[PDB]
XYZ file of C-alpha atoms in Angstrom:
99
model
C 0.000 0.000 0.000
C 1.540 3.231 -1.230
C -0.590 6.190 -2.243
C -1.868 8.317 0.616
C -5.128 10.193 1.038
C -8.019 9.775 -1.369
C -11.362 10.978 -0.064
C -10.061 14.072 1.684
C -8.538 15.218 -1.586
C -11.938 14.851 -3.208
C -13.707 16.302 -0.194
C -11.492 19.371 -0.135
C -12.030 19.423 -3.881
C -15.765 20.023 -3.777
C -15.111 22.358 -0.870
C -13.128 24.794 -2.981
C -15.249 24.300 -6.077
C -18.319 25.007 -3.978
C -16.850 28.005 -2.194
C -15.986 29.320 -5.637
C -19.567 29.183 -6.857
C -20.681 30.572 -3.517
C -18.100 33.307 -3.952
C -19.897 34.482 -7.069
C -23.122 33.993 -5.148
C -24.125 30.716 -6.754
C -25.736 27.687 -5.155
C -23.586 25.246 -7.090
C -19.935 24.333 -7.497
C -17.626 26.030 -9.969
C -14.217 24.756 -11.009
C -11.743 26.797 -8.999
C -10.063 29.059 -11.563
C -6.777 28.717 -9.716
C -5.262 30.255 -12.825
C -7.169 33.448 -12.124
C -5.561 33.364 -8.699
C -2.224 32.396 -10.200
C -2.277 35.085 -12.864
C -4.151 37.641 -10.793
C -3.263 36.959 -7.151
C -3.710 40.639 -6.386
C -7.441 40.318 -6.933
C -8.463 36.736 -6.262
C -7.605 34.768 -3.145
C -9.113 32.520 -0.500
C -9.154 33.576 3.134
C -9.796 31.807 6.418
C -7.327 29.113 5.433
C -5.382 27.627 8.353
C -1.823 28.550 9.250
C 0.899 27.210 6.986
C -1.988 26.146 4.783
C -2.095 28.059 1.489
C -4.860 27.888 -1.090
C -2.930 25.359 -3.142
C -4.277 22.241 -4.811
C -5.643 19.482 -2.565
C -3.797 17.006 -4.753
C -0.554 17.673 -2.918
C -1.281 18.385 0.728
C -0.921 15.689 3.361
C -3.462 13.484 5.095
C -3.540 15.772 8.142
C -2.982 19.035 6.309
C -6.031 18.068 4.286
C -8.202 17.778 7.372
C -6.679 20.975 8.709
C -8.466 22.684 5.843
C -11.804 20.926 6.159
C -11.658 21.679 9.864
C -12.051 25.294 8.812
C -14.404 24.707 5.906
C -16.711 27.282 7.448
C -14.010 29.830 8.184
C -12.612 29.617 4.674
C -13.870 32.355 2.383
C -13.323 33.445 -1.200
C -12.646 37.077 -2.022
C -13.491 38.112 -5.562
C -12.470 41.619 -6.553
C -12.976 41.071 -10.263
C -15.990 38.770 -10.642
C -16.557 40.092 -14.143
C -13.466 38.107 -15.050
C -14.914 34.948 -13.549
C -17.938 34.827 -15.821
C -15.589 33.415 -18.431
C -14.859 30.488 -16.145
C -18.494 30.002 -15.209
C -19.185 30.232 -18.923
C -16.342 27.939 -19.915
C -17.334 25.308 -17.380
C -19.799 22.799 -18.777
C -20.555 20.427 -15.926
C -23.771 18.384 -15.924
C -25.447 20.943 -18.153
C -24.184 21.497 -21.677
C -25.601 24.928 -22.412
């Protein structure tokens, strides 16, 4: 046996995705446009995150570090300064609804 976490990763996954959508004021999940945060960090960023726990991908953190996040899944918050730039993402995304 050599792999590591599994569910947590997924769990934290939806977490972010969700928060994202919620950030825009949606009731669904929206692929976290990390890029937007990577290209425009001085506009988009997640807050509430735990100490020594950045808003990086969940497909890297540890088993504990993963929980550390979830633990504060209510404290975590997404700050969107330029939501008009997110529409593209929300538009790009297809999900279970090809429109």
